[PDB]
Amino acid sequence: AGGQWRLQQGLAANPSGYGPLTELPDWSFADGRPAPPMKGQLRRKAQREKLARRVVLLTQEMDAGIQAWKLRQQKLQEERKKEHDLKPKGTLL
Amino acid sequence: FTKSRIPDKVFQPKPEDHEKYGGDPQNPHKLHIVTRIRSTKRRPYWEKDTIKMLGLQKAHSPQIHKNIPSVNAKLKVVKHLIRIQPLKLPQGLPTEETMSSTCLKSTGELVVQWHLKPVE
Amino acid sequence: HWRVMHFQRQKLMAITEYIPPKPAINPRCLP
Amino acid sequence: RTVSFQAKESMIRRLEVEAENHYWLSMPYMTAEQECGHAAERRAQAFEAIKAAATSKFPKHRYIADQLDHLNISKKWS
RNA sequence: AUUAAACCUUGUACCUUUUGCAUAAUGAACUAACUAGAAAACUUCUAACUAAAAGAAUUACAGCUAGAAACCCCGAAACCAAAC
RNA sequence: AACGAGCUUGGUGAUAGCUGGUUACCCAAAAAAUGAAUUUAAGUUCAAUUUUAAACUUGCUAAAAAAACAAAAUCAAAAAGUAAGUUUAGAUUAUAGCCAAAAGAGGGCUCUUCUGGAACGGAAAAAACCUUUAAUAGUGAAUAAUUAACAACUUAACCAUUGAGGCCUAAAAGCAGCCACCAAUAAAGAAGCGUUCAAGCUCAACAUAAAUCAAAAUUCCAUAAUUUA
RNA sequence: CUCUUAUCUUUAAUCAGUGAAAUUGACCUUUCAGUGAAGAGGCUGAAAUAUAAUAAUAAGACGAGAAGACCCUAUGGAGCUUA
RNA sequence: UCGGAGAAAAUCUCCGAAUGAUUAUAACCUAGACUUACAAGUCAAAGUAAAAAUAUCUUGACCCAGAUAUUUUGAUCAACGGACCAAGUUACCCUAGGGAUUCCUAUUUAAGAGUUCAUAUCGACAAUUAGGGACCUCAUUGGAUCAGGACAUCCCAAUGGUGUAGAAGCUAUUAAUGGUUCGUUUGCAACGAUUAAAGUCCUACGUGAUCUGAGUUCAGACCGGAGCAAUCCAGGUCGGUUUCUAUCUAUUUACGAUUUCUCCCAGUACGAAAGGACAAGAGAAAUAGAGCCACCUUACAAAUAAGCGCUCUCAACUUAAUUUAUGAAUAAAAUCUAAAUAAAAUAUAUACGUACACCCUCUAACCUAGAGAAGGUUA
């Protein structure tokens, strides 16, 4: 229950998704020393980092491909407006 | 039963469509968020292949893809088995410092600062 | 004779049925 | 044989999601011509990785320490 | 599972066979014992020596020598020879 | 004491393309029933598939224009999404499917081609329909499909006026039959029908008032239920 | 036979002694409708239901047996006849 | 076996070839390809050589035998990937296996029939998403016993209509109540005499561990017809062996009646006569069910059991077709009402009755109680 409502509030549909309840550490030592990170959290972070790097890589490749395309199109323009040698006329040329 | 070619009119939006989904016909988004939400079992083999090519073997796990025609061409093949959502970057693209602090929201936003604290 | 239609096909017909517009007030009751 | 209320509602939901898929697929960031070659480098090096693994197959090194270590099985307290 | 053996819940015996299905169909009263994959032409793996290898006879334009690695059980109606 | 040809021993562990059986664990991959020849269709050999190892380089999808017939199977530069593919060496098994859906061909069935399937969930029970990426412990959670569904549109009570219009059946009356398609009027042509034909029972007028569809054979077979957002 | 009846003996049944046979996956072995290949004690949904014997019937367990019948197959046989 | 044409590449629709004549005589060699499981089969640049470019048109392996002086030739091997050379028959049979064991009828329509008059009784064209049944050839079902069920009703019962005067009939609705005979010739029918009627179907011929006749269908034997014979025929005929001790399930202790005829009403109502009713009422039987033994009969040449003897059998709260009364929608002095109401009216049935009802000693004997056990009786 409540999956659709949670999505509207910006939360994950399943309470076990991204949120304080799951991601926050489940315990710490009585001394206050932090506990070793949970294996699930470390794995989930690694996937998230991998997802971000793909986002950067794809954006950079597309943007470059756009900029590089412009430069090529410019060259074709200038190449067209090329003149050489001379233009004699008349009964002798 | 054979592969079908969808008429081009299907992918030409209408003015009200822009209003409903809130996407500007100019400044189009760059990256897709694609998730498989149906099974490839009982589907023709070509649909099975495109799903593997796009990386959507596991369901309900999002994959990022380029919003370019060649990628789009494959996505149109499996339009019925997936959900496409435009990736949003409220705080900009992640940098080296923020690479380890990202989180993809259900809304389609990749936030680069993830604190797990009350907004306050 | 009728030939049975696949469930999925029958489901499509069920969802594509014509829906007529309904008036707020019947014309008869109005002046 | 009529079609349930569950069955007709759920399909319409799927149709609406697919309807949105139509819209988001209508706004390509790059045109076809602009697309050419923007990812040539990555595709080239990727295959070079495939070839490198394929042609690197070879037997494994053999060591004396492995063979002579079997003698440790008869180690004792003198 | 349970506080509780049984009540409540879930669950169409097995092998072969059909077809990749049976509510088909074959076989099984049960216990103990006995009861059915065997060979090195080529290939692969491990070593010895190497333009040569092998303890005679053989092979050889990196080969040759040695080791390792393999291919079931039960069942007719019949046929023939010699006795009875 | 089983004679279409006795019995016993040996040949002999006869042969059987046929029936049956073929004994520990775990990991992995995995076809077919397409094609071809066969005294061959209860078999086998080859192709094709699959597989293991090895060598090195392009493969899959998609693929414009343009071509070969034509408004998608061949073919198929650049790309892009992706990780496979060709050759070398070795090797069996397999060669009879099943059901749903789609297009044809013969003529309901039966051939041919294309697609999918083989739940532990749902459809009642349910190999073949729908939902379902593998398989693990947990007294956590979000979800998918989900045998159920809400007959259909005006008489009211009234009034009906000739020379039988002729002619084929004496003569044929709104009116036997056929053709004119008829008479004044506030208002009426002759509608059923009556009549040998006219008997006339009296429709429309005048004259008064309102007015086409959409959930048979053993013994019925869950129980029930019209409204709480 | 209509239309069966009575009596006696055999068998039966009870007591004593002796003591087989085919058969048998396991059984804590129900009725109705459905589903299914003509098909259900065992599946689906209803229903019924203290537990064990003794003596009877034969609807069912496609009840059990025999070297029975029927069609087809094998590059399996055999008897007989010939042109 | 291969080739040509269509279907259009899976099986179907058609024609041809196992060559033929013409000829310029058409060489050798060698890149790259087609086709193809293998095998066989296609096309061909360049070079060389002959000549002075050209072959035009429309198919069988290996082995083994030959012929010439290297060169060549041998298949309706046509079952056409071809065994060097072999046919019938078996019901005397065997083994290894695989299988199986148009015409109704109900609806809709209505030209024409019915003197007149569509629908009293019927009925063309059709309509039902409607229910059942190469020239020749051809093969499970009766009976007995006991029956369960459907209703699409044969009789019995309640009704509508009529070309229903009465009596006989016809048609339709409702109803599954109990019943629905005995023989002859028969192998499927064919008849006789009766009846209120002698229904139509389903249950694996309903039912062979209940029984029985055929047939499938054989070992013997004849005719007729085939074949040289053995043998054979879906042609005749006569003869001709299937057994079972029940393990499981299931089952084995009441009922409250059907039909027919005669008498009466009454030879009346009706009807010209002929002929001839209904309801109401009384009495006889037949069959079924449940019992009994005074008589009769048959037995035990017993104190008993039987039928061929005797007796007894009934109530309906609850409905269907149909018919009335009151009365709205609907100005009626209408309308039986999937309006509110009041009644009558088949077959069914269990509301309502009858039966049962007791907690029960038992050494033993006896018993009209009984397989055992149970049960009854005991100055």
Ligand code: FES
């Ligand atoms: S809605 Fe009833 S007449 Fe106006």
Ligand SMILES: [Mg+2]
């Ligand atoms: Mg069988």
Ligand SMILES: [Mg+2]
């Ligand atoms: Mg032999």
Ligand SMILES: [Mg+2]
């Ligand atoms: Mg053998």
Ligand SMILES: [Mg+2]
């Ligand atoms: Mg064989």
Ligand SMILES: [Mg+2]
């Ligand atoms: Mg195929």
Ligand SMILES: [Mg+2]
């Ligand atoms: Mg051939």
Ligand SMILES: [Mg+2]
């Ligand atoms: Mg041959």
Ligand SMILES: [Mg+2]
């Ligand atoms: Mg390419």
Ligand SMILES: [Mg+2]
């Ligand atoms: Mg004894």
Ligand SMILES: [Mg+2]
């Ligand atoms: Mg029991």
Ligand SMILES: [Mg+2]
């Ligand atoms: Mg049943």
Ligand SMILES: [Mg+2]
């Ligand atoms: Mg049950």
Ligand SMILES: [Mg+2]
């Ligand atoms: Mg006993």
Ligand SMILES: [Mg+2]
């Ligand atoms: Mg029995």
Ligand SMILES: [Mg+2]
């Ligand atoms: Mg054969």
